[PDB]
Amino acid sequence: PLAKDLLHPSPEEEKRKHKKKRLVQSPNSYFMDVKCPGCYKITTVFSHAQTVVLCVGCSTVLCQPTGGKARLTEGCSFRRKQH
Amino acid sequence: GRMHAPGKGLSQSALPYRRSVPTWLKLTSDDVKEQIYKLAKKGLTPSQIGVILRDSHGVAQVRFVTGNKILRILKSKGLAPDLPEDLYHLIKKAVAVRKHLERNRKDKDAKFRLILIESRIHRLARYYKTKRVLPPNWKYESSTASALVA
Amino acid sequence: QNDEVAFRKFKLITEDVQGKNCLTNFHGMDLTRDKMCSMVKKWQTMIEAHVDV
Amino acid sequence: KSLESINSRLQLVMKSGKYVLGYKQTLKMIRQGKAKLVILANNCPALRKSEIEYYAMLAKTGVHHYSGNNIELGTACGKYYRVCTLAIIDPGDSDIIR
Amino acid sequence: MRAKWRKKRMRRLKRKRRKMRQRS
Amino acid sequence: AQRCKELGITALHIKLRATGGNRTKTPGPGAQSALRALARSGMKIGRIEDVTPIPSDSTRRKGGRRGRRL
Amino acid sequence: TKKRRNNGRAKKGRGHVQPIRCTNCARCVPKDKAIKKFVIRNIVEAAAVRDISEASVFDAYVLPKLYVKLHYCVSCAIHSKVVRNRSREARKDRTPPPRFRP
Amino acid sequence: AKRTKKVGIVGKYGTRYGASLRKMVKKIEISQHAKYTCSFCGKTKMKRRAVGIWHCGSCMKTVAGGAWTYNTTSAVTVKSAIRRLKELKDQ
Amino acid sequence: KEVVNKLIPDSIGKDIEKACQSIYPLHDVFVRKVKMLKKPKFELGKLMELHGE
RNA sequence: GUGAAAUUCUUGGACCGGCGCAAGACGGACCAGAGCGAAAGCAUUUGCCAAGAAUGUUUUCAUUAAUCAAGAACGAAAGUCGGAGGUUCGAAGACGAUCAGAUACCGUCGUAGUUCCGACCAUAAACGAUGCCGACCGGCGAUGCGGCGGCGUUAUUCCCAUGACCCGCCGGGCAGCUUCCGGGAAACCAAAGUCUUUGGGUUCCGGGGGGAGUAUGGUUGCAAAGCUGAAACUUAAAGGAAUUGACGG
Ligand SMILES: [Mg+2]
Ligand SMILES: [Mg+2]
Ligand SMILES: [Mg+2]
Ligand SMILES: [Mg+2]
Ligand SMILES: [Mg+2]
Ligand SMILES: [Mg+2]
Ligand SMILES: [Mg+2]
Ligand SMILES: [Mg+2]
Ligand SMILES: [Zn+2]
Ligand SMILES: [Zn+2]
């Protein structure tokens, strides 16, 4: 196609493109509210965290670092930050 | 591509367009500065300080929230490392490779990697002496560099 | 064995003979050549292990 | 991993804590009762090692047998001389759990 | 000739030449 | 077969063998005819198995790296 | 002129492929260059299957197979007619010849 | 200043005995007269006393080693083999 | 004795194949071979209980 | 053993079959237009030791970079030196055949070598006969690694994770098919394209065929040889890609 609209690509292909090859760079990661069961406090955790995140009120782990995304422990809740 | 490898990878970090601090970040500039001070006392290099702060405390960019970079903050407080982090790690790797090589004399691959690492060390040292981070007469001696790292 | 598979062979070395009977005991076993060669095929990985016990 | 961890912790004991390098000063610190960790190179003479271990048993302080030698312990301390025995008065870096 | 055998012939001739010159 | 019959042997297990080793693994022209003749001469046939010596790896095969030039 | 794009061998991202000996003449051939034929042949001839089965002591005895992998240098392959020369256009296909099941 | 191009320690032999023999004896003489690091006291004072005998100046430790080197590769492999056989002999 | 009678049906290979399914599926799993390396002194009573009762 | 033979081994039991023992090589099939490595090259298991690409990253430094005379490391095989080892194969050599001759091709034996450790040498059709870094310019289906997202099937368990498949997306690779992108003398090449519409940066290097990679000088090497490297003279072509024919044991 010779008349592709480069100025206004739809969010489908905008998301499917690589982070750097987008029109404006967009990180694919995010921050999440994590809720450990048996605890009241809420932890702000990076999605792609490289470190074992621990509760301060309890000696329990919230995520385990992996290749791309930290795997949250089972029974822990999480929600997005400001989309 | 890579300096000393035939790799042309693209894995990087896409810093977001919004330079503003997120609204849910309750932490203030002095609080983040205190956290950096405590981590540096515990002995973390600035890369590790940034990684810990992003992973656990929810701060996206220390420069965005405080206005100064992590190494700037450390140097202002006066507890920055004498050697730069990357040069220290390169010298660490060179010392480790030399320690392996003095036991494995037939590891010509290790000799080749050692040559590459030392070339990187000398180029980075030239840059740091140009920027006057390092003393003008600072020289990397392979024999004496063992006591500088680890 | 009455109704077992046929691709398995046993060595059965003889230790003692009494009268007109030689008496054997286990010495080893092996798969047959045709079975072993038929099992090996392309586009697949085979894992081989050995242990002294 | 333990050896690199102890080397890093030793490096951070240097430049940030109070220590003392050497046999005579180590014994002096132990019998003053202000030595919290005594590190011995495996190159150490057996009689000296046994005596320092007995002193540490009397003083209720820990002894770590560095998996190096006196040259490598000096290097881990960051010095250009061999150290065969050393004592940490206070770590400053949680080498010694409170 | 084959180029490799011309190379070999040249090498033989060069050894002979070196020997002759060394004899002086 | 006739010697075995007069010595009182009626059935035969079979072990076919080629040259083996680092040399050829295909049985020669005589295996088929020998086994068929044993079958047709009245001898009963039991198990049949290849016992060609197969190296897990062998010494260098003779012939040089340019082979047998013919 | 370059006769084949792949240079007559399957080596693409390698420096060195270990050699094998031609089963016909014992010539060292690169393993990826040699012509390989995996022959799975009945251990007895189809002319003699009936005689063997009749002389068998067993009733439902399935005759064993013979699994031989053959490696050829291209000289012995062409001489033995396992491969043939092809036209310039016909050299470009890699589909093996049909098995001819009927 | 550098005094010899290649003979080094065998310059004391002059033009005698043959270049290949001098080259052969050069490495042996260097390792013979070298001072090794003592594995007991850590100092670089372990030197040869007689053939096969290596004495340290500081700790006065004497070791039975090789003729020209402090230890031979044969003896090192032997020590490793004996350790392996001992740990296999016991359990 | 009860090693031989349990490798007669290749129970060892069957349980190996069952165990490995959580790593990568396997289908043709056998104890391909076993060879005797040493033997204990040839107790005739043990040989006779192996043969008879 | 061969096309056929013969040299050779054999009633002294050769070959064959069985059981053992020893030694040194070699790691089949799995093994692929699959992977890794700067290339050379790298394939039995397990452990140790450092190293690495790619991927992931809202980590850190902040221009630290690209190519690179001189110089430096590695560099198949063969070859050289010293020490072990020497099963097989096998330059030289011997013999048997073949032949008009046969110093060969074929066969029997067999030295150096081939194996290991240490030191040299620095050459290969060391090839993709194709410099590196960067951007742009078609389509398609695969494959390897990493990551991300989804119907389902499967493994345990009570469920999700996690493996194995299935369908996709992204990045970096090894490649493949196809195309009037374009280029080219063409073969062909998605690079060998974006070149008379000629300029992204930079290194090496060619100037008709021979003489000649020769002579000489220098330099390296234990040697073999490596690097650098002419001229006199001679010649009208030598070459490349395709077409038609002729010919092919
Ligand atoms: Mg021919
Ligand atoms: Mg041609
Ligand atoms: Mg090559
Ligand atoms: Mg070599
Ligand atoms: Mg030798
Ligand atoms: Mg021979
Ligand atoms: Mg350029
Ligand atoms: Mg010219
Ligand atoms: Zn052939
Ligand atoms: Zn000493």
Domains of chain B: 26-80 (no CATH), 81-150 (1.10.287.10)
Q: Which of I52, I43, I50 is nearest to I3 (CA)?
A: I50
Separation between the CA of F36 and the C1’ of J34 (whole angstroms): 45
DSSP-derived 3-state class of residue G41: strand
Residues G70/G40, Cβ–Cβ less than 8 Å: no
Contacts of I7 (CB under 8 A, 6+ apart): C29, I31, I34
What are phi and psi for residue E9, nearest 5 degrees? Answer: -65, -40
Q: Please tell me the distance from the alpha carbon of residue A76 to that of residue A55, in angstroms, as a whole number.
A: 12
Which of C26-44 are b and which e, b meaning 16 or more Cβ less than 10 Å from the residue's Cβ? beebbbbbbbbbebeeeee
Residues A76/A45, Cβ–Cβ less than 8 Å: no
Q: Please tell me the distance from the alpha carbon of residue D79 to that of residue F62, in angstroms, as a whole number.
A: 64
* One-character DSSP codes across D15-69: TTSEEEESHHHHHHHHHHT---EEEEETTS-HHHHHHHHHHHHHHT-EEEEESS-
Residue G5, CB, strand J, below 7 Å: yes
Q: Which residue has the tokens 């044993």?
A: F38
Residue H19 CB coordination number (10 Å): 11
What are phi and psi for residue C13, nearest 5 degrees? Answer: -70, 150
For D:17-56, CB contacts with H below 8 A are 43
| Radius of gyration of chain H from its Cα atoms, rounded to whole angstroms | 18
Cα B140 to Cα B80, B133, B143, I14, distances in angstroms? 21, 15, 9, 61
What are phi and psi for residue D89, nearest 5 degrees? Answer: -75, -45
Q: Please tell me the distance from the alpha carbon of residue C37 to that of residue C39, in angstroms, as a whole number.
A: 5
Domain containing G98 equals 1-102
Contacts of A65 (CB under 8 A, 6+ apart): A49, A50, A51, A52
Residues G39/G70, Cβ–Cβ less than 8 Å: yes
Q: Verify whether the Cβ–Cβ distance G67 to C38 is below 8 Å.
A: yes
> CA angle, corner B68, sides to B51 and A25, nearest 5?
60
Contacts of H52 (CB under 8 A, 6+ apart): H64, H65, H66, H67
Q: Please tell me the distance from the alpha carbon of residue B85 to that of residue F46, in angstroms, as a whole number.
A: 78
Extract the tokens encoding H49: 């006393």
Q: Which of G75, G89, G91 is nearest to G33 (CA)?
A: G75
Distance G1 CA to ligand 2 centre (A): 7
Q: Please tell me the distance from the alpha carbon of residue G90 to that of residue G98, in angstroms, as a whole number.
A: 15
* One-character DSSP codes across chain B: --SSSS----------S--SPPTT----HHHHHHHHHHHHHHT--HHHHHHHHHHTS--S-HHHHHSS-HHHHHHHHT---SS-HHHHHHHHHHHHHHHHHTT-TT-HHHHHHHHHHHHHHHHHHHHHHHTTSS-TT----TTGGGGG--
Residue G29 CB coordination number (10 Å): 24
Q: Give the closest of G25, G44, G48 to F68, CB-based.
A: G25
Give the rounded distance of the alpha carbon of E11 from its chain centre. Answer: 3
The DSSP letter of residue F60 is P
| Helical (H) or strand (E) element with G55 | helix G49-55
Q: Please tell me the distance from the alpha carbon of residue H68 to that of residue H74, in angstroms, as a whole number.
A: 13
Beta strands at H53-56 and H62-64: parallel, antiparallel or unpaired = antiparallel
List chains adjacent to chain C, taking adjacency as at least 3 C-beta pairs closer than 8 Å.
F, G, I
Q: Please tell me the distance from the alpha carbon of residue A69 to that of residue D70, in angstroms, as a whole number.
A: 45
In C1-53, DSSP assigns E strands to: 8-10, 13-18, 21-25, 28-31
Give the rounded distance of the alpha carbon of A3 from its chain centre. Answer: 35
* One-character DSSP codes across H10-63: GGGGTT-S-HHHHHHHHHHHHHHH--BPPTTT--S-EEEEETTEEEETTT--EE
| Radius of gyration of chain A from its Cα atoms, rounded to whole angstroms | 17
Residue B127, CB, strand J, below 7 Å: yes
Contacts of B106 (CB under 8 A, 6+ apart): none
Distance I17 CA to ligand 10 centre (A): 59
Q: Please tell me the distance from the alpha carbon of residue I6 to that of residue H77, in angstroms, as a whole number.
A: 44
**Environment class of F22 (CB within 10 Å of its CB; exposed 0-12, middle 13-18, buried 19+):** middle
Q: Please tell me the distance from the alpha carbon of residue I4 to that of residue H2, in angstroms, as a whole number.
A: 77
Q: Which residue has the tokens 């069961």?
A: A37
**Environment class of B130 (CB within 10 Å of its CB; exposed 0-12, middle 13-18, buried 19+):** exposed
Phi-psi region of A68 (alpha: psi -120 to 50; beta: other; left: phi over 0): alpha
Half-sphere exposure of A67 (CA within 13 A, CB side): 1
Q: Please tell me the distance from the alpha carbon of residue D51 to that of residue D23, in angstroms, as a whole number.
A: 11
Contacts of F19 (CB under 8 A, 6+ apart): F25, F52
Q: Which residue has the tokens 């940490």?
A: D88
Phi-psi region of D72 (alpha: psi -120 to 50; beta: other; left: phi over 0): alpha
> CA angle, corner A29, sides to A25 and A32, nearest 5?
140
DSSP-derived 3-state class of residue A22: coil
Strand J: which of residues 48-77 in chain B lie with Cβ below 7 A?
A: 48-51, 54, 60-63, 69-72
Q: Please tell me the distance from the alpha carbon of residue F17 to that of residue F63, in angstroms, as a whole number.
A: 23
Q: Which residue has the tokens 């002319």?
A: G47
Residue D69 CB coordination number (10 Å): 20
Q: Which nucleotides of J are covered by protein (CB under 7 A)?
A: 1, 3, 17-18, 20, 24-45, 49-66, 72-76, 81-82, 87-91, 105-108, 117-119, 128-130, 132-134, 146-149, 154-156, 159-164, 169-178, 187-189, 192, 212-216, 222, 224-225, 240-242
Q: Which residue has the tokens 């330079």?
A: B19
Q: Please tell me the distance from the alpha carbon of residue A28 to that of residue G11, in angstroms, as a whole number.
A: 39
Domain containing A19 equals 1-83
Q: Please tell me the distance from the alpha carbon of residue B127 to that of residue B84, in angstroms, as a whole number.
A: 12
Residues B150/D68, Cβ–Cβ less than 8 Å: no
Residues A32/A81, Cβ–Cβ less than 8 Å: yes
Q: Please tell me the distance from the alpha carbon of residue D58 to that of residue D63, in angstroms, as a whole number.
A: 12
Q: Which of F34, F63, G27, G17 is nearest to G7 (CA)?
A: G17
Q: Which amino acid is at C31?
A: L
Residues H39/H45, Cβ–Cβ less than 8 Å: no
Extract the tokens encoding D23: 């046999």
Extract the tokens encoding F66: 């340019």
Residues D11/D97, Cβ–Cβ less than 8 Å: no
Closest residue to J31 measured CA to C1′? C42
Extract the tokens encoding A76: 């822990």
Resolution in A: 2.7
Q: Please tell me the distance from the alpha carbon of residue B146 to that of residue G16, in angstroms, as a whole number.
A: 39
- Residues of chain F with Cβ-Cβ distance to G23 below 8 Å are 24-25
Q: Please tell me the distance from the alpha carbon of residue A55 to that of residue A61, in angstroms, as a whole number.
A: 7
Residues D90/D36, Cβ–Cβ less than 8 Å: yes
Structure obtained using: cryo-EM
Q: Please tell me the distance from the alpha carbon of residue D51 to that of residue H60, in angstroms, as a whole number.
A: 21
Residues A32/A79, Cβ–Cβ less than 8 Å: yes
| Helical (H) or strand (E) element with F14 | strand F11-16
Cα B101 to Cα B95, E22, H35, I11, distances in angstroms? 10, 46, 21, 49
Q: How many domains does chain A have?
A: 1
Question: Bridge partners of A32?
Answer: A45, A80
Q: Please tell me the distance from the alpha carbon of residue A33 to that of residue A45, in angstroms, as a whole number.
A: 7
Contacts of D38 (CB under 8 A, 6+ apart): D26, D30, D52, D56, D61, D62, D63, D64, D85, D86, D87, D88
Residue D29 CB coordination number (10 Å): 24
Distance H40 CA to ligand 10 centre (A): 5
Q: Please tell me the distance from the alpha carbon of residue B134 to that of residue H67, in angstroms, as a whole number.
A: 49
Q: Please tell me the distance from the alpha carbon of residue D96 to that of residue D12, in angstroms, as a whole number.
A: 12
**Environment class of D85 (CB within 10 Å of its CB; exposed 0-12, middle 13-18, buried 19+):** buried
Q: Please tell me the distance from the alpha carbon of residue H39 to that of residue H41, in angstroms, as a whole number.
A: 6
Extract the tokens encoding B128: 């740091």
Residues A9/A23, Cβ–Cβ less than 8 Å: yes
Q: Please tell me the distance from the alpha carbon of residue B59 to that of residue C10, in angstroms, as a whole number.
A: 70
**Share of chain C residues as helix, strand and coil, in percent rounded to the nearest 5:** 15, 35, 55
Q: Which amino acid is at H69?
A: T
Q: At what angle do helices B108-130 and B85-101 cross, to 10 degrees?
A: 160
Q: Which of B85, B95, B94 is nearest to B40 (CA)?
A: B85
Contacts of B71 (CB under 8 A, 6+ apart): B46, B80
Q: How many domains does chain G have?
A: 1
Contacts of B31 (CB under 8 A, 6+ apart): none
What are phi and psi for residue F23, nearest 5 degrees? Answer: -90, -165
Phi-psi region of B11 (alpha: psi -120 to 50; beta: other; left: phi over 0): beta
Residues H55/H75, Cβ–Cβ less than 8 Å: no
Which nucleotide C1' is nearest G6 CA?
Answer: J33
Extract the tokens encoding B28: 């203030």
